[PDB]
Amino acid sequence: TVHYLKDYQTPAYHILKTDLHFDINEPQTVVKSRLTVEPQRVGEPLVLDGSAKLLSVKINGAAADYVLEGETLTIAGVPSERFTVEVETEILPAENKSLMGLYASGGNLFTQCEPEGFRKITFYIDRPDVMSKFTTTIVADKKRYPVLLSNGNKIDGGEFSDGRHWVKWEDPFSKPSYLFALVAGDLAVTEDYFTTMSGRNVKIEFYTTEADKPKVGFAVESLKNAMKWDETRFGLEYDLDIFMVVAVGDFNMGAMENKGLNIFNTKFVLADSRTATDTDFEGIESVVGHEYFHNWTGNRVTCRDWFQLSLKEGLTVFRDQEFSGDRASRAVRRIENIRLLRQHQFPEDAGPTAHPVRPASYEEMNNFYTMTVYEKGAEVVRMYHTLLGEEGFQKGMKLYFQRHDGQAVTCDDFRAAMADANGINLDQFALWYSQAGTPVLEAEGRLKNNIFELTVKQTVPPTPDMTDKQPMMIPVKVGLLNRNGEAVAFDYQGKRATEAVLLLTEAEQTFLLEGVTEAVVPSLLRGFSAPVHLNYPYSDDDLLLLLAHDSDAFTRWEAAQTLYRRAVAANLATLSDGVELPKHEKLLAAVEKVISDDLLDNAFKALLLGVPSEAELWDGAENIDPLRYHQAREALLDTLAVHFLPKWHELNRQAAKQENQSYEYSPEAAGWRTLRNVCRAFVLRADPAHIETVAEKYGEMAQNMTHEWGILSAVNGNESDTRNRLLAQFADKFSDDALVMDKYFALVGSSRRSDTLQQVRTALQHPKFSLENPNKARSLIGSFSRNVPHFHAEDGSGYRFIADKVIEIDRFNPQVAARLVQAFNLCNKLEPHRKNLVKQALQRIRAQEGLSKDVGEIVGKILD
Ligand SMILES: CC(C)C[C@H](N)P(=O)(O)O
Numbered sequence: 123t124v125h126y127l128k129d130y131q132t133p134a135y136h137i138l139k140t141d142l143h144f145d146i147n148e149p150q151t152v153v154k155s156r157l158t159v160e161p162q163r164v165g166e167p168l169v170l171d172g173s174a175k176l177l178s179v180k181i182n183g184a185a186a187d188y189v190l191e192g193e194t195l196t197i198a199g200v201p202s203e204r205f206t207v208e209v210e211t212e213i214l215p216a217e218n219k220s221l222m223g224l225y226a227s228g229g230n231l232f233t234q235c236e237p238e239g240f241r242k243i244t245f246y247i248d249r250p251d252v253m254s255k256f257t258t259t260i261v262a263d264k265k266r267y268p269v270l271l272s273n274g275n276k277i278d279g280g281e282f283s284d285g286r287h288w289v290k291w292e293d294p295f296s297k298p299s300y301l302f303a304l305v306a307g308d309l310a311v312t313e314d315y316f317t318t319m320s321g322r323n324v325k326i327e328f329y330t331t332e333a334d335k336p337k338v339g340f341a342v343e344s345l346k347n348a349m350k351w352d353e354t355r356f357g358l359e360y361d362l363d364i365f366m367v368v369a370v371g372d373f374n375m376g377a378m379e380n381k382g383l384n385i386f387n388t389k390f391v392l393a394d395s396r397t398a399t400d401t402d403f404e405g406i407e408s409v410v411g412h413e414y415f416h417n418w419t420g421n422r423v424t425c426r427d428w429f430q431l432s433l434k435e436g437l438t439v440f441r442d443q444e445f446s447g448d449r450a451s452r453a454v455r456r457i458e459n460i461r462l463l464r465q466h467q468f469p470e471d472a473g474p475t476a477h478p479v480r481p482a483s484y485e486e487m488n489n490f491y492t493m494t495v496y497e498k499g500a501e502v503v504r505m506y507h508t509l510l511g512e513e514g515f516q517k518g519m520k521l522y523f524q525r526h527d528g529q530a531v532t533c534d535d536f537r538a539a540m541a542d543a544n545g546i547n548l549d550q551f552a553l554w555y556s557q558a559g560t561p562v563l564e565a566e567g568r569l570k571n572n573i574f575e576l577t578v579k580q581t582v583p584p585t586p587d588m589t590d591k592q593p594m595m596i597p598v599k600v601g602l603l604n605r606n607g608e609a610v611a612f613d614y615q616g617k618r619a620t621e622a623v624l625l626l627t628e629a630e631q632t633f634l635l636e637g638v639t640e641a642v643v644p645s646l647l648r649g650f651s652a653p654v655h656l657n658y659p660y661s662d663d664d665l666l667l668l669l670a671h672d673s674d675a676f677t678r679w680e681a682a683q684t685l686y687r688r689a690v691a692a693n694l695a696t697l698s699d700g701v702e703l704p705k706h707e708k709l710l711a712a713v714e715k716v717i718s719d720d721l722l723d724n725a726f727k728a729l730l731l732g733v734p735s736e737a738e739l740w741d742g743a744e745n746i747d748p749l750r751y752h753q754a755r756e757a758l759l760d761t762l763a764v765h766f767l768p769k770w771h772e773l774n775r776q777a778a779k780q781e782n783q784s785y786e787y788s789p790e791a792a793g794w795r796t797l798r799n800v801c802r803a804f805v806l807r808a809d810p811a812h813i814e815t816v817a818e819k820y821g822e823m824a825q826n827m828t829h830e831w832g833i834l835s836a837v838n839g840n841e842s843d844t845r846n847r848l849l850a851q852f853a854d855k856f857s858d859d860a861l862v863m864d865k866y867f868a869l870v871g872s873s874r875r876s877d878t879l880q881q882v883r884t885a886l887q888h889p890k891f892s893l894e895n896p897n898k899a900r901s902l903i904g905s906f907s908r909n910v911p912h913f914h915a916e917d918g919s920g921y922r923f924i925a926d927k928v929i930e931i932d933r934f935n936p937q938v939a940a941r942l943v944q945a946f947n948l949c950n951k952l953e954p955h956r957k958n959l960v961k962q963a964l965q966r967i968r969a970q971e972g973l974s975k976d977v978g979e980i981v982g983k984i985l986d
């Protein structure tokens with residue numbers, strides 16, 4: 123059964139009011155609903171989605187004539203005017219290991235409804251174009267469940283003689299079912315507030331365990347920053363006098379934007395310097411912002427159907443990116459976002475599971491919360507901003523909300539708003555939503571007369587969903603550098619400037635940059651103006667010049683990235699010919715200049731010193747031996763480590779002094795620590811024995827989690843017993859902090875050491891490990907699945923291990939399993955031996971009785 127976008131049809135029924143009543147007992151919870159249903163197409167049967175135990179169903183107080191089949195409840199004869207439906211269901215939250223619907227965690231109850239989890243609570247028209255006004259009543263034992271939360275305003279509540287108490291929540295904003303939330307349990311609260319631009323106080327309440335409460339401070343501040351920023355940048359104001367955030371340790375995703383009651387994975391809300399890295403802090407800031415920004419881009423305006431997921435996700439990611447960029451280090455953080463895209467989204471677009479930003483079909487919608495919908499989706503939204511500028515973009519946002527506030531709409535509606543608000547045609551831009559695959563740009567430069575003539579051709583490869591690909595609208599931002607590396611002015615188009623956005627709209631175009639009175643090297647795709655591969659015949663010297671002198675952060679970084687890529691390509695060639703490694707003279711020269719350049723921003727310097735991942739390196743390759751690519755990359759890192767060993771120390775000490783004992787989080791101090799941790803990584807592969815010196819003064823250097831993690835990461839591949847000891851001491855010191863134990867299992871799973879597989883298998887039985895906890899499963903098993911030398915081991919042990927865990931995990935959590943099985947996505951691009959073994963593994967997963975729809979869909983894409 124496949125769902126198709128082209129088959130969309132408006133619902134035959136609307137739900138106007140949704141009154142819910144929760145009776146929480148041990149072990150079961152009884153849900154009583156009362157829906158006010160309004161016919162849209164009179165005469166049609168009422169179809170309700172649902173998978174919970176059905177106890178009773180009524181139409182207007184009378185027992186209904188119905189049939190239950192699969193997860194569908196049908197009532198043939200329903201009135202032609204407004205009527206009530208009353209469904210009574212029973213749930214066993216403690217048995218819910220899928221972490222979808224109503225489930226237990228840490229003795230408390232939580233919900234996760236997006237995309238289609240609400241049907242697991244009650245029978246409902248569970249689709250996002252059906253919006254209803256919710257009133258939620260909750261009854262439970264007061265001692266066990268003192269805190270009872272749902273969307274909106276608490277308007278009533280009371281006590282019963284027998285120890286139970288109740289509450290009543292009213293969400294006045296019509297919403298789809300996927301934004302419903304309920305929380306019941308014993309939780310500590312952190313209180314604060316934000317006053318809106320119109321003088322209205324908004325009560326802020328963060329709910330966590332008693333012990334985790336001290337770690338929620340940074341998240342509260344980030345929210346208040348996010349609330350202020352949305353006002354100042356977008357003119358968007360919060361619309362309730364209460365905003366609640368709940369932390370939960372068992373959670374499939376990062377966080378959830380349920381209206382006025384966000385539910386967060388602990389990893390994106392808890393932090394202190396002692397237990398969280400600077401990266402963790404930045405993560406909290408991004409995600410807290412993200413979930414708050416959904417209140418307008420997702421909740422006030424929602425999705426007509428789930429094919430439109432990127433409408434709220436691409437747009438909201440773009441917003442949290444701009445939020446983070448406005449806070450600090452925009453350039454550095456832009457590179458990070460670009461790096462993430464090329465390292466995870468590009469592989470996806472090149473693989474068997476490739477899909478457009480707006481899919482045309484899906485079997486299981488949970489499989490499409492992907493890098494493509496999110497990150498490429500953001501890049502698509504960012505291109506509007508590039509084409510229109512900030513003011514023009516905000517004009518689109520204004521008209522978007524003017525038209526569609528309180529509606530469930532599509533990506534086309536967003537595009538129309540951008541188009542109409544600025545009086546511009548964006549018909550061709552629609553292809554960014556419908557055409558999958560990474561576009562490839564072939565560029566040629568020619569200076570004849572006094573005009574730099576830039577030819578550019580685009581090509582979009584076929585993908586499993588679509589062969590035909592038409593030319594797309596691709597903004598290419600460009601500049602010119604002379605022999606000395608200073609910006610050269612040119613005329614385009616009737617305007618003399620130092621920078622221009624060349625709009626490529628067809629298969630091949632030539633752009634005329636006139637008024638060029640000297641030799642130039644072009645700077646291309648500045649700021650990563652479009653999500654594409656660009657090929658230009660740069661000399662190594664051209665790259666040295668761009669890296670050294672160009673004014674755009676990305677192009678400088680990309681120039682360094684290109685030199686690294688070429689170096690690894692050389693290593694591959696020599697290792698293949700059974701010959702000495704290359705010398706990499708021009709590369710080593712560049713790295714030396716980077717290391718010694720005191721003018722480079724510390725964090726930007728760290729990025730320039732990062733080598734592209736194996737996935738980037740074998741991009742577009744056939745018959746891949748992942749270990750040869752691994753060997754070639756490792757060889758380059760060894761060369762850089764050993765060659766610059768004393769300067770790594772020097773840079774290390776420089777960073778230590780500039781940090782200046784400022785161990786709490788700040789973008790400034792974090793920049794030095796990032797650079798410090800790069801140096802440690804290089805030092806400790808050049809001189810592994812240095813670990814004992816580090817171990818000797820561990821307590822001295824373990825001044826925050828950034829330092830501990832940085833040190834443990836640097837030594838994680840060390841074959842010394844000291845590596846194991848430090849890991850064991852780490853687990854002991856932080857045994858009580860679940861989020862830090864995640865870091866422990868990540869180190870175990872990711873180690874380059876020869877004995878990683880058996881250490882991983884021992885870790886499975888660690889008292890603090892739980893396969894049923896998504897964070898733990900990802901940390902240990904996810905990391906191993908990405909551990910190239912071990913996952914792609916020749917004997918196939920990595921394949922068999924991961925396949926076993928996919929099978930095992932899928933028995934209780936298909937979402938984690940479906941994510942994990944995508945470690946096999948490289949199947950058909952592997953050399954014959956490994957490909958055979960991967961197919962065997964995939965066949966074995968497929969042969970499982972009761973295999974989830976989630977995993978089945980993915981395995982299908984790879985095998986069939
Ligand atoms: C599926 C769900 C929990 C993801 C949220 N919509 P996010 O994209 O805001 O994390």
Ligand SMILES: [Zn+2]
Pocket residue numbers: 379412416434435438
């Ligand atoms: Zn989101």
